């Protein structure tokens, strides 16, 4: 996952 996770 690239963002948030």
């Amino acid at each position, epitope marked *: *996952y*690239e*963002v*948030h*996770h």
Partner: antibody
Amino acid sequence: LIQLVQSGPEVKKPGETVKISCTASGYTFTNYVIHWVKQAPGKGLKWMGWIYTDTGEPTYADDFKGRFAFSLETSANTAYLQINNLKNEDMTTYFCAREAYPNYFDYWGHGTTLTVSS
Amino acid sequence: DVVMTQTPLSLTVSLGDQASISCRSSQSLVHSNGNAYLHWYLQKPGQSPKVLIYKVSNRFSGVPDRFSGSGSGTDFTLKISRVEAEDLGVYFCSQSTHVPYTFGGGTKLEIKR
């Protein structure tokens, strides 16, 4: 072939509880985040939140913190949406979606329609 | 929430012609990592939405090359070249730069016959 399949149409009275399922096949369930998306009025889309399939930790959009609960049965590759104390405004279609690693939704459930009526 | 505004609400395109849909965000969609997490979905009548374009311009596997996305900051465009009948339905822009994730109101593509 990857598929998200949802449980069939639901018909509830106001104030009742419903629990909708989202079953994933064709990949390692615990490696992807599952989201819930509501069909907004005028056939718009509204993000409800996600659940981490590895930790079971849910994140709700503000409007879904009160009456909505995400849960897992990871051994059944299944995510659940539970709605308590059903309201008229809950009456719509609910989608589950898998989040791709570049943070878009790659696979969607076909949807579950919820009727709220006396 | 980041508000996603689509224009037009509806467009009518002849087979083989080009459709252009605009999406404007209430905040920059440029993430701290320098990418914009702006995606396009098509929802056909009675179906779930399906991704066409992710991160502004990336085509999802099996999406024809006549779908192209562009833009930066707050202003994004989906272009559908060589429109085909099965293109009809509701196009949504969506952002996942920010939580909550948000959707545009949709643009209905109508085929001219």
